[PDB]
Design a protein around this nucleic acid. Structure first.
Ligand SMILES: [Zn+2]
Ligand SMILES: [Zn+2]
Ligand SMILES: [Zn+2]
Length: 85
DNA sequence: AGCGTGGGCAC
DNA sequence: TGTGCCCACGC
């Protein structure tokens, strides 16, 4: 509720100053972080990190039940539930 | 499946 | 003033 977004259409607010200014990038279209492999620009450093794994094939997250690996923790999370029948 | 991408947040 | 996870959607 403290920090807020000045643009007309939006009615959003952020507790941390950083999240307000991160959101503002949606409006300005700023994409600060670039992939030195395919040159594609991204809005967030964390999304650039996971994107790079699509190129390298790095998959740090293994399923506890079957061991299948994933580049992202949420992909693994989405996967694990399939072992429930 | 593969994976873009914003919000909540701890640090 | 960032960095970097977890979470959630969406397609
Ligand atoms: Zn806004
Ligand atoms: Zn790339
Ligand atoms: Zn599995």
């Amino acid at each position: 509720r403290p920090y807020a977004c000045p643009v007309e259409s939006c009615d959003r607010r952020f507790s941390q100053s950083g999240s307000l200014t991160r959101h503002i990038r949606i409006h300005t279209g700023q994409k600060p972080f670039q992939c030195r492999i395919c040159m594609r620009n991204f809005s967030r450093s964390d999304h650039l990190t996971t994107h790079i794994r699509t190129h390298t094939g790095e998959k740090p997250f293994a399923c506890d039940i079957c061991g299948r690996k994933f580049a992202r923790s949420d992909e693994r999370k989405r996967h694990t539930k399939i072992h429930l029948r």
